[PDB]
Design a protein around this motif. Structure first.
Motif, short mmCIF file in Angstrom:
data_model
loop_
_atom_site.label_atom_id
_atom_site.label_comp_id
_atom_site.label_asym_id
_atom_site.label_seq_id
_atom_site.Cartn_x
_atom_site.Cartn_y
_atom_site.Cartn_z
N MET A 96 -10.14 2.66 12.00
CA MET A 96 -9.95 2.10 10.67
C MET A 96 -11.25 1.97 9.90
SD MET A 96 -10.04 -0.78 8.52
CE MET A 96 -10.14 -2.15 9.66
N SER A 146 0.84 -1.18 0.00
CA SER A 146 0.00 0.00 0.00
C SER A 146 0.88 1.23 0.00
CB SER A 146 -1.04 0.01 1.12
OG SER A 146 -0.45 -0.15 2.39
N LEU A 158 -12.38 0.51 5.81
CA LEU A 158 -11.99 -0.16 4.58
C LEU A 158 -13.04 0.01 3.49
CD1 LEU A 158 -10.62 -2.43 2.77
CD2 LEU A 158 -11.95 -4.09 4.10
N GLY A 183 -4.28 0.17 -1.55
CA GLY A 183 -3.63 -1.11 -1.67
C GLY A 183 -3.53 -1.56 -3.11
N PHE A 215 -7.95 2.15 2.39
CA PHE A 215 -8.22 2.11 3.82
C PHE A 215 -7.89 3.46 4.43
CE2 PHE A 215 -3.96 1.01 5.67
CZ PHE A 215 -3.29 0.57 4.53
N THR A 270 -0.27 -2.97 8.83
CA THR A 270 0.14 -1.60 8.55
C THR A 270 -0.16 -0.72 9.76
OG1 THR A 270 -0.22 -1.88 6.17
CG2 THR A 270 -0.12 0.35 7.02
N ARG A 321 -4.97 5.36 2.49
CA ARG A 321 -3.97 4.59 1.78
C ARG A 321 -4.67 3.78 0.70
NH1 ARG A 321 -2.57 6.25 7.27
NH2 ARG A 321 -0.39 5.56 7.70
N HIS A 361 -3.33 -7.24 5.87
CA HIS A 361 -2.42 -6.20 5.44
C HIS A 361 -2.70 -4.88 6.16
CE1 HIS A 361 0.04 -3.69 2.82
NE2 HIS A 361 -0.98 -2.86 2.83
N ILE A 362 -3.96 -4.50 6.25
CA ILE A 362 -4.33 -3.25 6.91
C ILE A 362 -3.91 -3.28 8.37
CG2 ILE A 362 -6.34 -1.91 7.69
CD1 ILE A 362 -7.71 -2.67 5.11
#
Length: 186
Positions: A96, A6, A98, A60, A70, A121, A58, A117-118
């Motif tokens: 957060m 990302s 998404l 991805g 995200f 991160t 961000r 992944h999120i």
């Protein structure tokens, strides 16, 4: 299998994509189905306006193509911080959201790999000690995705128009539930 990278959003070239994704009915919980480009530019710019650089949107990527957006946001400037919600702010909390792309061709396990992944991160690039989420109580898909990476429900709180379900994922619970971000709970 999916492996994602990302980068920070770039409004001057991501706007068209993000606006398109927000118009897809599967994105309806973002409540931007009929938004204009200006509306989405404001959304992105506002998400990037915190004084702390860890916050912001961000994008991805996989195989050179955009896959999702995200947002890592400051809880203190969100609905979480309304008086009386029951949220107990801790230093290092990061909120957060998404948004998946409007593409519908996916390999197995797409959203699980997205969520891993999120979360990695948030904890290991953005310094979160805990991730906080507040989806609509009716958004069952997100509840299942949260549970898959170790979120625990804290309670429900009213917003004007809907009810939010407050959940927390500590760094420690994520490590245990996902084997350090490798797999989904269980």
């Amino acid at each position: 299998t999916y492996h994602f990278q990302s980068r920070r959003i770039d409004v001057d070239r991501d706007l068209e994509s993000v606006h398109r994704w927000l118009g897809h009915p599967k994105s309806h919980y973002w409540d931007m189905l009929n938004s204009s480009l200006a509306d989405v530019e404001k959304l992105i710019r506002d998400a990037g306006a915190d004084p702390d650089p860890r916050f912001g949107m961000r994008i991805g990527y996989f195989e050179g193509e955009r896959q999702f957006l995200f947002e890592l946001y400051n809880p203190l400037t969100s609905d979480l911080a309304r008086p009386g919600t029951g949220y107990v702010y801790e230093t290092g909390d990061i909120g957060m959201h998404l948004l998946v792309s409007s593409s519908e061709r996916r390999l197995p396990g797409f959203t699980g790999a997205v969520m891993l992944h999120i979360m990695r991160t948030a904890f290991f690039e953005a310094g979160a000690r805990r991730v906080v989420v507040e989806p609509d109580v009716r958004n069952a898909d997100v509840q299942r995705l949260n549970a898959a990476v170790g979120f625990r429900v804290a309670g429900d709180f009213p917003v004007p128009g809907a009810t939010a379900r407050l959940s927390y994922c500590t760094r420690e619970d994520f490590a245990r539930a996902t084997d350090n971000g490798r797999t989904l709970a269980g």
